[PDB]
Design a protein around this ligand. Sequence first.
Ligand SMILES: *[C@@H]1O[C@H](CO)[C@@H](O[C@@H]2O[C@H](CO)[C@@H](O[C@@H]3O[C@H](CO)[C@@H](O)[C@H](O)[C@@H]3O)[C@H](O)[C@H]2NC(C)=O)[C@H](O[C@@H]2O[C@@H](C)[C@@H](O)[C@@H](O)[C@@H]2O)[C@H]1NC(C)=O
Ligand SMILES: CCCCCCCCCN1C[C@H](O)[C@@H](O)[C@H](O)[C@H]1CO
Length: 498
Amino acid sequence: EFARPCIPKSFGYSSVVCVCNATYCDSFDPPTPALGTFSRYESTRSGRRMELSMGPIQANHTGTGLLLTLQPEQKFQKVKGFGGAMTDAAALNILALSPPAQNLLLKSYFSEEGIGYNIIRVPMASCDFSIRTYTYADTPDDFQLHNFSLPEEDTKLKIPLIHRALQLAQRPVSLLASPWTSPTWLKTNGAVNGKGSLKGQPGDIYHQTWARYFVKFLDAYAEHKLQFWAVTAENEPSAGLLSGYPFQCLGFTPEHQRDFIARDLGPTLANSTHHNVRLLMLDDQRLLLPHWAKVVLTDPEAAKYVHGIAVHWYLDFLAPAKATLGETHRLFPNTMLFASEACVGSKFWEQSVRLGSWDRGMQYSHSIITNLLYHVVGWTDWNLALNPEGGPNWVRNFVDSPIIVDITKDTFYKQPMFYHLGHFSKFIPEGSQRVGLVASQKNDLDAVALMHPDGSAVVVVLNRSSKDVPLTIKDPAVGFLETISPGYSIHTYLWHRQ
Ligand SMILES: *[C@@H]1O[C@H](CO)[C@@H](O[C@@H]2O[C@H](CO)[C@@H](O[C@@H]3O[C@H](CO)[C@@H](O)[C@H](O)[C@@H]3O)[C@H](O)[C@H]2NC(C)=O)[C@H](O[C@@H]2O[C@@H](C)[C@@H](O)[C@@H](O)[C@@H]2O)[C@H]1NC(C)=O
Ligand SMILES: CCCCCCCCCN1C[C@H](O)[C@@H](O)[C@H](O)[C@H]1CO
């Protein structure tokens, strides 16, 4: 409960990382405020890291500058929350630190003294961010799944770390499970990767067996006293449609997904002790919307089992939000939209890890604001931690992560992505509702307004431009916040409307 500042370090990129070790990590002062004043948290490319300041709320405003007006009566989605993924690679990196440094990393993410993550994505067995290739049922032709078992990657690594995150967290934490591959003996191609789907057709022994695997997985985590909020129907089902797909995948067309959900996965979950665990469909690029939503959700047998739609961010440049997220929401407003995976550095021409990249931070916060403005209820980072190479990864498919672990130094680095994510996760608890926010003029800022469950306000303002922008936020209940959005900054504004 002590403020400790960022120990900045440059690696020659646009901004700094914050250096943490066994005895030091940047942290916040204890809560907290007074009515008629606002709190501002600010992070800048120049090096400010979620720094707290306060200001007055005035009764009047005059000027022709930018005005952002809250519309608290204009109510949209409730927020599920924010988090990242406990992959094999993340677990290995976290556990490579000395235990005191491990605790500071886990606190950064999961503690109220950090950034208040309340979501953890858990791969069901191996993915690219694994050093070995395994499923939970590798013994061939085990249709009864008698040899389904959790290996050490779960029992020694992932599960104990998840328990530690839960113990650190004040907020209830939600777990999300997603599979990459089924056992190879359930697959047309008999391999964890490449083009291939489940054998046969939905409703059959292979599909009933795969659905039961999900139940066995939830059974096995429940033995270790962990319960899931949600599962996805498959990670990136389109990937297994692609010739030579280089790592674990399982192909589904949207019709295949529809019918597997309707016949096997939905009923098998609903008839299990795990009937309250929610099912998210898609878990793939938003350009697949609204088409995938139409195929799955217009079939009433599938629709009755689908709680929400999971999206990944990787091809967002191909997929304007209004045409995809917006249209899906219009058509299916009762089916929540959830961002389930994102990372920078995964394009083949990109440097995997750019320590201290401001651009990569702005990419996260711009995606988050844009998602929230188009009805999305949560946003989930990929690997919680990686090494300086962006690994480990058995196919060398290295990417970036908000926290980079340097084993030889018993050190970890919090990147601008961490702080950009924290501008949301720390200040937007589960149950917050996105409300209206209108601009008086054309502007280059990204901004979103939400209402906390206690009625207080939160506004995030991202300035991706080089230019300082003075501005005023109007709340009809309280008054005006006179402020400024510096070039290359992100601010979170908090105030009580009491
Ligand atoms: C873990 O990370 C912390 C924070 O960076 C390290 O503590 C810091 O160590 C610095 C020295 O490396 C201290 O800096 C300086 O102060 C002196 C005299 O006042 C100046 O002349 C000098 O040029 C530096 O600016 C800094 O005060 C200290 N910060 C805190 C809050 O403790 C820590 O280093 C380890 O502990 C410190 C107290 C020293 O004993 C270090 O020699 C020692 O390495 C980091 N841990 C490790 C293992 O690197
Ligand atoms: C073939 C066309 C390329 C389209 C881009 C799709 C990129 C997906 C990125 N990918 C998602 C998977 O869920 C993770 O397992 C993987 O680590 C991550 C980054 O490669």
